[PDB]
Amino acid sequence: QQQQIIKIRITLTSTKVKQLENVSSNIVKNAEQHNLVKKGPVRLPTKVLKISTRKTPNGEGSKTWETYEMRIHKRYIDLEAPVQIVKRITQITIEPGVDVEVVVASN
Amino acid sequence: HKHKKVKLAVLSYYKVDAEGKVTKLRRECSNPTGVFLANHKDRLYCGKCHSVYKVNA
Amino acid sequence: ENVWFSHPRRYGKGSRQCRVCSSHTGLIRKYGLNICRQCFREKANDIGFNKFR
Amino acid sequence: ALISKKRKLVADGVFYAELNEFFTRELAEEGYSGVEVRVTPTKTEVIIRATRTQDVLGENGRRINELTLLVQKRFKYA
Amino acid sequence: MLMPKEDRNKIHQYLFQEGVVVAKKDFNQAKHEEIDTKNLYVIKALQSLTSKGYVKTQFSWQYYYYTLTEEGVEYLREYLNLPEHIVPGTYIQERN
RNA sequence: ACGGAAGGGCACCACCAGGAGUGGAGCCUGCGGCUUAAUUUGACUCAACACGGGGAAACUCACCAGGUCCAGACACAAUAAGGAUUGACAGAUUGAGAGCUCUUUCUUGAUUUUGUGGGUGGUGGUGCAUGGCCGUUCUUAGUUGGUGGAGUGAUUUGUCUGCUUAAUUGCGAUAACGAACGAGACCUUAACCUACUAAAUAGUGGUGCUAGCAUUUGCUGGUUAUCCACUUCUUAGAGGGACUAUCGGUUUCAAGCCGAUGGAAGUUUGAGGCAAUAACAGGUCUGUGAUGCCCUUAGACGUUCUGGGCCGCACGCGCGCUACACUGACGGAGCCAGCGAGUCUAACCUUGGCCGAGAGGUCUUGGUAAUCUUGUGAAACUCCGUCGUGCUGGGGAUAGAGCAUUGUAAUUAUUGCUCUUCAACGAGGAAUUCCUAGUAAGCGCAAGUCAUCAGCUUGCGUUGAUUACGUCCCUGCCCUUUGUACACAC
Ligand SMILES: [Mg+2]
Ligand SMILES: [Mg+2]
Ligand SMILES: [Mg+2]
Ligand SMILES: [Mg+2]
Ligand SMILES: [Mg+2]
Ligand SMILES: [Mg+2]
Ligand SMILES: [Mg+2]
Ligand SMILES: [Mg+2]
Ligand SMILES: [Mg+2]
Ligand SMILES: [Mg+2]
Ligand SMILES: [Mg+2]
Ligand SMILES: [Mg+2]
Ligand SMILES: [Mg+2]
Ligand SMILES: [Mg+2]
Ligand SMILES: [Mg+2]
Ligand SMILES: [Mg+2]
Ligand SMILES: [Mg+2]
Ligand SMILES: [Mg+2]
Ligand SMILES: [Mg+2]
Incomplete structure (x- = not known):
């Protein structure tokens, strides 16, 4: 309860890299001026969800295909912080x- | 395509002044919905027994 | 009181339909969309599927 | 509830698309323009971008708790 | 064809209890969520309400959203035998 | 607009040089025809014919033979509480353990019935009534106006002789000047970064700790409060990098083009995404709770259930798979990808052990996933052998017997496996398709479909050519001049 290590992992997933990197920046900064020992934001490989469809609602025409994509970006950060203050700062905004x-480890 | 719904009165109950007490045979059993049922040909139509029915008359 | 009103619809075409139009044909099942191809095209932008390349 | 990130984010998009069509069909005379979904811990807030924000809120909160009841009942929200 | 009065009561009381119903367009479902009756029963009961008024109906992706009307509240409260205007039924209930 | 008029262009959906083929065989698959109870349909040059995401056992399904049900709101007039209505055991009947209908007598209770209106549903009609979308003209390079100039006018110039480009891209010429759309820019992706930020879900070196060797350090197995360090390889954020740079040649010395050097990169750096105006009686009413109108609506064209058909086979055509062998088949050994997908929101992706010739089974495991399947140990390929020019140990159609798996169900054989049968086919006619570099071609793998089923498609990597960097001969399209009695425009 009073300055205790928690072994936390914060995993951030999104389809919008800009805001995903804003939240990542906010976490890293809040670890920084609070003097944490943190493992930097690890960026997992982007996942491209591909759906390939014929364009024509019927079957007539030249056989033209579309490949729609959804990009999923995944990051995670590891922190060793007292639970109360980081819970207050990370539950909000x-x-x-x-x-x-946000998941607790027993490692 | 149904019963005629004729003006049926109470059946299996004979009278009340039948020289001179009430005469209703087939004394009250555990079938209240006592009540009189269908007999087709040496059979009775299971009407209330959702689980068990072991009786023949 | 109706035992004759239902035949198995656990697998195959008849077991599935579009969540938008209830069509059994052209159904997209990847990632659990369960939308037909035509309705997916008309609704891909607000699901999050975009054209890039 | 134990779903992969792929299928979860797809379901989130399908949730948005259905919400958008529902509000398009319901909020016609209310000048509905679009919808936004912010998922916070313990609460998901749905922002409806509308032109006349008077009739959509009805009187004392009419047609906005009706919509909240309909949305939570279709999507199984506590 | 028909519909038991108990099931029609338990749908009307559910409708009046919060003002809205959501019913997936799936006949043969045999169980509506949080109404102890057939999905076909809730769809047709609410359709009978809608045709005479009393209810607004919207479809939107196979799901049959149903809303009580200000004139159908009076009919439901007379139907369910509830105190007159004592219970709004039940829109303006807590937050106000 | 058209021309069996002239000129100019462009383009491997044109040709040249060629590569691989296709057309010939057997199978697969779509189409027509024939057959049928039905063999449901739409589409017919490009721009119909592995297309409708159309790999149909049921479902899908629209068709055929049948059997149920109403899920016919609502309003009105009758019908009823001396009961409007509902549902059934058993038997007959029925494919049926459908009370469908009869026999029977119970059950239920203005929830319904009958008629009238009025609704509803409909993969019923109409795509020549429409919307939306898509395809095509055309992924070509084209379109438009303000002011000015020409003309009574419709109209015209600008928007062009030439040169140049992939481009109406530009340089120029110039009664035009300055603009907008389209093109380009843009966006996504691929390639570079020992420079930045970091990583036990990526990897590497030491070793706190070990450990197994053969040896005395080469190969390796292990732990990250059962260690230290780092970021080259991987990942992804922020950036940088190319601008055809430099040099030379050539051009009206301009736009540009060519060569060399350098460079990760010099074909618009590669490939794509988006993509103007005006249109087509192009396709779709069978994607849509998009939709007008017509048709039907209880003995139904609504919906469901059982069975069947969609696959039916004198035949004609299209996309394809496998081959005709030794640049091979077969056996053994070596043995290397990238793109994916995946279950508690229920049985998905499955390691390992065991059993079985096999297909498969079985007991556990890990994974909601850079974590586990999975280093997806893929195939072609490589090496060592057997065979030896024989329709042969090429080829594997057809067919028999059996063992399995998916599924309610496999017969008209779902698919797999085993043994057996061992057809055509000896390189393919007239004709015809696609293609210029990590391309063609070969080879597989994942994904879509999916319970099962790919000889299909969408992607991915593995191996990796030959030929030409061109022309207008053929075909098509565009432009200019020209002719027109065409404008429902040859
Ligand atoms: Mg040639
Ligand atoms: Mg051939
Ligand atoms: Mg052939
Ligand atoms: Mg059938
Ligand atoms: Mg002018
Ligand atoms: Mg002009
Ligand atoms: Mg532009
Ligand atoms: Mg551009
Ligand atoms: Mg690096
Ligand atoms: Mg048309
Ligand atoms: Mg067929
Ligand atoms: Mg790999
Ligand atoms: Mg032989
Ligand atoms: Mg052989
Ligand atoms: Mg054999
Ligand atoms: Mg099949
Ligand atoms: Mg196909
Ligand atoms: Mg040709
Ligand atoms: Mg003449």
Whole structure:
């Protein structure tokens, strides 16, 4: 409760890299002036969701195909912080379009 | 395409002044919905027993 | 009181339909869209699927 | 509830597309323009971008808690 | 064809209890969520309400959104035998 | 607009030089025809014919033979509580353990029935009534106006002789001047970064700790409060980098073009995404709870259930798979990808052990995933052998017997496996397609479809040519001049 290590991992997933990198920057900064020992934001390979469809609602025409894409960007940060203050600072100001998962480890 | 719904009165109950007490045979059993049922040909139509019915008359 | 009103629809075409139009044909099942190809085209932008290359 | 990130973010897009069409069909005379979904911990807030924000809110909150009831009932939200 | 009065009551009371119903357009579903009756029953009961008024109906992706009307609240409260205007039924209930 | 008029251009959906083929065989698959109870349909040059994401056992399904049900709102007039209506055991009947209908007598209770209106549904009609979308003209390079100039006018110039470009891209010429759309720019992706930010979900070196060797350090197995360090390789954010740079040649010495050097990169750096105006009676009413109108709506063209058909086979055509062998087949050994996908929102991707010739089974495991399947140990390929020019140990159609798996169900054989049968086919006619560099071609793999099923498609990597950097001969398209009695425009 009083200055105790937590072994936290904050996993950030999104389809919008700009805001995903804003939240990542906010986390790293809040670790910085709070003097943490943190493992920097690890960027996982982008996942490209591809859907290939015929363009024509019927079947007539030249056989033209479309490949729609969704890009999923995944990052995660590891922190060793007291639970109360980081919970207060990270529960709040959750930017839209970014899914945040905070998980405790026993490593 | 149904029963005629004729003006049926109470059946299986004979009278009340039948020289001189009420005469209703087939004393009250555990079938209240007592009540009289269908007999087709040595059979009775299971009307209330959702689980068990072991009786023949 | 109706035992004759249902035949198995657990697998195959008849077991699935578009969540938008209820069509069993051209259905996209990747990632659990369960939308037909025509409706996906008309709705890909606000699902998050875009054309880049 | 134990879903992969791929299928989760696809479902989130499909949720948005259905919400958008529902509001398009319901909020016609209300001048509905678009919708935005912010998912915060313990609460998901749905912002409806509309021209006349009076009739969409009805009187004392009419047609906005009706919509909240409909949205949570279709999408199984507590 | 028909519909038991108990099921029609348990749908009307559910409708009046919060003002809205959502029913997936799936006949044969045999169980609506949070209404103890057939999905076909809720769809047709609410359709009978809609045709005579009393209810607004919107479809939107196979799901049958149903809303009570200000004139159908009076009919439902007379139907369910509830105190007159004592219970709004139940839109303006807590937050106000 | 058209021309069996002249000129100029452009383009491997044109040709030249060639490569691989296709057309010939057997199979697969779509189409017509024939057959049929039905063999549901739409589309017919490019711009129909592995297309409708169309790999149909049921479902899908629209068709055929049948059987149910109403999921016919609502309003009005009757029908009823001396009961408008509902549902059934058993038997007959029925494909049926459908009370469908009868026999029967129970059950239920203005929830319904009948008629009238009025609704609803419909993969019913009409794509020549429409919307949306898509395809095509055309991915070509084209379109438009303000002011000015020409003309009574419709119209015209600008928007062009030439040169140049992939480009109406430009340089120029110039009664035009300055502009807008389109092109380009842009965006995504591929290639470079020992420079930045960091990583036990990526990797590497030491070793706290070891450890197994053969040896005395080469190969390796292990732990990150059962260690230290780092970022080259991987990842992805921010940036940088190319601008055809430099030099030479050539050009009306301009736009540009060519060569060399350098460079990760010099074909618009490669490939794509988006993509103007005006149109087509192009396709789709069978994607849509898009839709007008017509048709139908209870003995239904609504919906469901059972069975069947969609696959039916004198035949004609299209996309294809496998081949005709030794640049090979077969056996053994070597043995290397990239793009993916994946279950508790229920059985998905499956390691390992065991069993079985095999297909497969079985007991566990890990993975909601840079973590585990998975180093997807892929095939072609490489090496060593067997065969030896024989329709042969090429080829694997057809067919028999059996073992399995998916599924409610496999017969008209779902598919797989085993043994057996061992056809045509000896390189393919007239004709015809695609293609210029990591391309063609060969080779597989993942994904879509998907319970099962790919000989299909969409992508991905592996191996990796030959030929030409051109022309207007053929074909098509565009432009200019010209002729027209065409404008429903040859
Ligand atoms: Mg040639
Ligand atoms: Mg051939
Ligand atoms: Mg052939
Ligand atoms: Mg059938
Ligand atoms: Mg002018
Ligand atoms: Mg002009
Ligand atoms: Mg432009
Ligand atoms: Mg451009
Ligand atoms: Mg690096
Ligand atoms: Mg047309
Ligand atoms: Mg067929
Ligand atoms: Mg790999
Ligand atoms: Mg032989
Ligand atoms: Mg052989
Ligand atoms: Mg054999
Ligand atoms: Mg099949
Ligand atoms: Mg196909
Ligand atoms: Mg040709
Ligand atoms: Mg003449």
